[PDB]
UniProtKB/Swiss-Prot annotation, chain A:
Pfam families: AAA_26, Aminotran_3. It comes from Arabidopsis thaliana. Its EC number is 6.3.3.3, 2.6.1.62. PROSITE patterns: AA_TRANSFER_CLASS_3. It catalyses: (7R,8S)-7,8-diammoniononanoate + CO2 + ATP = (4R,5S)-dethiobiotin + ADP + phosphate + 3 H(+); (8S)-8-amino-7-oxononanoate + S-adenosyl-L-methionine = S-adenosyl-4-methylsulfanyl-2-oxobutanoate + (7R,8S)-7,8-diammoniononanoate. This is Bifunctional dethiobiotin synthetase/7,8-diamino-pelargonic acid aminotransferase, mitochondrial. It is found in: Mitochondrion matrix. Bifunctional enzyme that catalyzes two different reactions involved in the biotin biosynthesis.
Length: 748, 738
């Protein structure tokens, strides 16, 4: 729910290490900018230790008072400190009071106002006595501050004062722990502010500057310039070379070694460089805004969007996504004051999404490492770690006790297509062959490649308009569904209450009236049927229909008894989407072939996987290459996606890394506030609701999505079906905030 | 062509910065290892050394072990050699000088210490400056090569290779040290920073080694009472051990001999961690093939024919070369050229690969993956721009993202047919394509393929090839001249020359086509210039050019499938430049993304686009995978498109011409086509193919390649040095003589 503005440049001041000029750099910049109308410089120092002997914010205040007298250019100036620890406060003669977190709100302020003059505003948000890493100071002086509160506070300040330049001076190195222990570069990530890196002009500064630089990149920050103090080592050359001259490297003149030195003539001597640095920063912002302000119009002109009728998409609809931090997009809207705002990704970018901000950062690292170690290496007949590992994790988990082989493809569609080739051989070897057909459930869906399309029954997705070869190539049955209405779980079956959601999934029902009834209607219908293929539990693209699990269980046994290969398509259900790692756990039955993707890779990159039985495998063990399965894309098992998936499989499953993971460990905890779920099932305009795992869907008895968009919720519809989808790691607090927004809106 | 062994642990000693204990660390380790109560041997390499001879890390290790040896009272042979210095450095001892310099103190039978400084300079700054000041330089290869000699010369046993400076400090050549060592990908440990700011410094140094795909077995630093190890371990999720050495004596006069003893605990730990991590790495390698065969279902492979002995273990990749573990050749990693370009995806330099990695991490971190439809974000918008201004120059107006070639092709068909079934308002449709052409393994991409090893009933009942398939004239090099097969040329260029537009064959072609032209033909689809999966057949360009005009004249949509030809594979960015004609729809992948990750793209005409501009969503093209335009692939492709095209980043792009130069030895391509066993040869851009066990022989010459039955090819990246291709043809030619 953040909302920062871009009409005015706002920069982080980073530094490779300690004692490298960071605050001088801030001061030069502030100076070059102020000593030249209602021109205003806002200097934030959000974290400060060694207070009050050291106060970078005071220094900036001080040195500008001085530089102002030198240029003879009056200015208003102020230096405020908002919160300190108790010890820090005492150091200022202060019987101040401590909050539940150990901070004091100081009244401390230090204005020297000159009406109408260019204004300087310096602020230290949080201060500690001990001149040490904030993380230690916080525990020593029992004064802590949560990352959110820090960012939140910076946001208040930022908005309170929004020509204009804002500098936000970091504390310590790029990767130095903040008060909470969170490395500083991770703490600021949610805001993704551009910045400059104060480098190291000493011996070892090349290595130190490049590493610090690389570590900001690795977090997806942008660095407008690198600056350092000349120590006669000619450090800037290797720096520029490495930066391919794509980022300017400014070299400040040596600083006076005499501790008594004013620096006032050094600042003057360095005007050149500071002028440059300021322009580079001011510039880069304008250029960043120019591109943002043209991206929608250009998007509309150059893109061919999937599943979109362009005639209906207006530029004012086109969403500009500048970055993503876990569940939230950062979205540029110029119709504001040109501002970036968080907006929840509630379609999970087509059901691919899962990662924490935290996980996302970790994944990135793993990916860069994998890119660097393997990039992409030839799969067939070869082995390499990320792939071997991914396969092991897949078999010991989602394919536990049934799967023996893992076949890699690039996505769901390719996965499904391979499953068909697979199923049919198993069949046409079980019965030695004719003409084959799938059996599937109407409304089920399996990808948009022609083969994956054939196992789909006629739908908005099929026809003559999509594929003029689309026939509708199997035997399609209408499935009973299940859903939540006015506070109880119901059922809908072909013309031909449960006490709770679990009751439905229960084994109590294997001996019910309906198991027999189902068994009968199936056995009847069972132009040759070659394979069974289902979207276990949920019909996704179908409109988030929960299929009666018992129906599917029975159907699986029916085909299995008939020696028909069973294909589970868990591209959508797999890996925690529904609150379990496989739906194998919800149907009670196992398949012969299953397909995975979307969440397989934690929503970072596409990879897909098709698991097989020792038997389905064997049905291709011949003597000619011609009896092998000749399907395989160029990027088969690409190390990247493999390594990534390997990591997501583990992280999502582990109660340590994923805090939604429950005790038994086979299961997610409920994420969707029980109360609101009932509430929404009881709604006038709500026809039905389906809720399980990370999925909250409803059906209705362009408009409501509009309202949700204003509440910071991006989501995609399925015509009249409207859903909220989180990741395997989203906090129930967030889901609850999410249901609230949606409910209020329904009242419209 | 490198060949280093893993039966003995070999580690780089990295350090976050200068003055942090690096050489102490090396010394403790060496000590913990040699002062135990055999033919136990420690090889200490210091490949780069400045400040020589006042400073000699190699001498320090030599000295301190002499001392520690008397302290534990455990004799050892010891030696300290300096191989090359600069002239100034040499003079300081009464364009590199080679020195005799050696300093043995041999004790027969005792555990041996072997210290070596490979290259030394006298001044005390970054090697990169010392090299230009003392006019003594050394090329990265020569450095690595030298370390390899030493490594092999002396191959229980532990070898330490002590870096110079920071993780990211310039070597003599200017190459950051972490890049210089990449080709070897040796595991290592990172000596961290126990001082104020060491947390940030240690993490960034660490992340910069990871970003280069190195593995770090432990981090160690000297306690300065700041409790630095906690944030370190937290950050490392305790997955890497963080060893904390006790404070070092601040008195400059201190022996350190009692500190080293005091730190034995930590050094034993550190040595074990290192020794142990190698055994664990080897255990995994030594089981990977067997396990691969048990767990994998390999594409385009008959498992019954793949023996464990065949399974290749790939430990990493550095540009064009795999690092391959063979337990056979004395559990050793060896370079092996990726001459199938991992199914024609490959392109990147070692250099480019590193750059790409960074770009990808940044992209993963900035975007991971974000919803495409109706949205815009930079890597995607950028990629699209670069695509239209280049490969789709002056014809393409739309870019449609999919995940691979197959998905790309499938979308093209949906696209083509609507354009058609709106040009003629509709029936039943079928493609026209050339026999042997290929377009992916999804059923739709399969239909536009005529019967082949790839199609059938065994491969998919639903195949029927919904098309009209013509047998195409081909072209090829034989006994020193370009020929033709249809159902002699002066030079290869007389072939894509458009003066042949007015030849006898243009009208003959025009006629054979026009006949079959006017069961409805809905779209034209070709593999421009080359039939890839078909067996590397060069199709007569003129034939295709004509055929395009023929269909275009008939208002039939034209689909170029440049999934294989796109982006420099053939020495050009598109084949639009070789066919003279333009299409209505084109498909790209494989090299689109520099061979790093899969992405694919289908370009369209303003018109083909418009044929889907209705009022219902049901009218729109309802095709689109979950990862449509995934920021990663997009950002990556954007970068590869630029890098490959730019003479600055890609040195095969002629400075004057601005295009792939000629790569394959002209002399040797002739000798080959002129050879007995060699039936034909096709050679253009990055592709060298011939038609006719031999892959076995090539494997021994360090060349990994896939066949197409009897077709046998060598495929490099848009950036491979002709020197390498020449070395490549040589190997292949010699083998043919067998
Ligand atoms: C998304 C999906 C697919 C297809 O995966 P893509 O990567 O989108 O091709 C197949 N089946 C189901 C149930 C899906 O949800
Ligand atoms: C490789 C290839 C394809 C298919 O791409 P994948 O990513 O392998 O599915 C299509 N057409 C041609 C000519 C190709 O070479
Ligand atoms: C002289 C001695 N070998 C030494 O510590 C050299 C430092 C190397 C340069 C590291 C840098 O500036 O990044
Ligand atoms: C594999 C990928 N679809 C491709 O373009 C190549 C086609 C098949 C070649 C099979 C081989 O390597 O022998
Ligand atoms: C007191 C001074 N401001 C200071 O450098 C504190 C932070 C130290 C950096 C945290 C690290 O070790 O990485
Ligand atoms: C996008 C991916 N191929 C997938 O399976 C999702 C279903 C199709 C899109 C449904 C919609 O229009 O929102």
């Amino acid at each position: 729910p953040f909302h920062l503005p871009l009409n005015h440049p706002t920069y982080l001041i980073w530094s490779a290490n300690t004692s490298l000029g960071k605050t001088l750099v801030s001061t030069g910049i502030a100076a070059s900018f102020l000593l030249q109308s209602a021109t205003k410089l806002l200097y934030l120092k959000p974290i400060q230790t060694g207070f009050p002997s050291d106060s970078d914010s005071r220094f900036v205040f001080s040195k500008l008072d001085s530089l102002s007298l030198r240029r003879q250019i009056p200015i208003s100036i102020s230096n405020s400190v908002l919160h300190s620890s108790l010890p820090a406060a005492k150091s200022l003669g202060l019987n101040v009071e401590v909050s539940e977190s150990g901070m004091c709100s100081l009244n401390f302020r230090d204005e020297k106002t000159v009406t109408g003059a260019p204004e300087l505003l310096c602020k230290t948000l949080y201060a500690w006595e001990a001149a040490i890493s904030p993380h230690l100071a916080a525990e020593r002086e029992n004064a802590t501050v949560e990352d959110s509160v820090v960012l939140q506070m910076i946001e208040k300040c930022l908005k309170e004062e929004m020509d204009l330049l804002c500098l936000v001076e970091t504390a310590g190195g790029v990767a130095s722990p903040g008060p909470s222990g969170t490395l500083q570069c991770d703490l600021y990530r949610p805001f993704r502010l551009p910045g400059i890196l104060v480098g190291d002009g000493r011996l070892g500064g090349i290595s130190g500057t490049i590493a610090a630089y690389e570590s900001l990149k690795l977090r997806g920050y942008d660095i407008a310039a690198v600056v350092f103090e000349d120590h006669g080592l000619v450090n800037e050359v290797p720096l520029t070379s490495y930066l391919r001259n794509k980022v300017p490297v400014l070299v400040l003149p040596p600083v006076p070694k005499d501790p008594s030195d004013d620096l006032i003539e050094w600042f003057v001597e360095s005007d050149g460089v500071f002028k440059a640095l300021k322009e580079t920063m001011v510039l880069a912002n304008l250029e960043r805004l120019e591109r943002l302000n043209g991206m929608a119009k250009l998007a509309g002109e150059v893109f061919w969007w999937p599943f979109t009728q362009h005639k209906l998409v207006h530029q004012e609809t086109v969403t500009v996504i500048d970055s993503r931090c876990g569940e939230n997009f950062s979205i540029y809207k110029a119709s504001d004051n040109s501002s970036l705002s968080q907006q929840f990704d509630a379609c999970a970018s087509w059901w691919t999404q899962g990662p924490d901000p935290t996980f996302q950062a970790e994944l990135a690292r793993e990916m860069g490492y994998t890119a660097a170690r393997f990039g992409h290496v030839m799969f067939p007949e070869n082995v390499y770690e990320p792939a071997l590992k991914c396969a092991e994790l897949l078999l010991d988990g989602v394919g536990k006790g049934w799967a023996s082989r893992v076949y890699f493809s690039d996505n769901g569609s390719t996965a499904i297509e391979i499953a068909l080739k697979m199923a049919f051989r198993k069949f046409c070897v079980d019965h030695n062959f004719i003409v084959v057909k799938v059996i599937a459930l109407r409304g089920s869906y399996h990808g948009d490649t022609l083969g994956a399309m054939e196992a789909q029954a006629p739908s908005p997705y099929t026809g003559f308009l999509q594929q003029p070869w689309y026939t509708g190539r199997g035997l399609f049955l209408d499935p009973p569904t299940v859903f939540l209405s006015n506070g109880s779980w119901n059922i809908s079956l072909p013309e031909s209450t449960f006490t709770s959601r679990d009751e439905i999934f229960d084994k109590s029902r294997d001996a019910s009236t309906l198991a027999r009834i189902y068994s009968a209607y199936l056995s009847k219908h069972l132009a040759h049927v070659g394979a069974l293929i289902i979207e276990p539990v949920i019909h996704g693209a179908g409109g988030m229909h929960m299929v009666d699990p018992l129906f599917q269980r029975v159907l699986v046994n029916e085909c299995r008894n008939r020696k028909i290969p069973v294909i589970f398509d868990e591209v959508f259900t797999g890996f925690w989407r529904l609150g379990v790692e496989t739906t194998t756990e919800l149907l009670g039955c196992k398949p012969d072939i299953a397909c995975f993707a979307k969440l397989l890779t934690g929503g970072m990159v596409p990879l897909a996987v098709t698991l097989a039985t020792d038997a389905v495998f064997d049905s291709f063990s011949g003597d000619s290459k011609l009896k092998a399965l000749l399907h395989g894309h160029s990027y088969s098992a690409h190390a990247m996606g493999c390594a990534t998936a390997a990591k997501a499989i583990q992280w999502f499953k582990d109660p340590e890394t994923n805090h939604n993971i429950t005790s038994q460990g086979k299961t997610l905890r409920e994420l969707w506030d029980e109360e609101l779920v009932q509430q929404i099932s009881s709604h006038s305009a709500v026809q039905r609701v389906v809720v399980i795992g990370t999925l909250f869907a409803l059906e209705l008895k362009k408009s409501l999505l509009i309202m949700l968009r204003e509440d910071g919720i991006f989501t995609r519809p399925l015509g009249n079906v409207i859903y909220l989808m989180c990741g395997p790691c989203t906090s129930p607090e967030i889901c609850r905030r999410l249901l609230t927004k949606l409910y209020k809106r329904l009242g419209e």
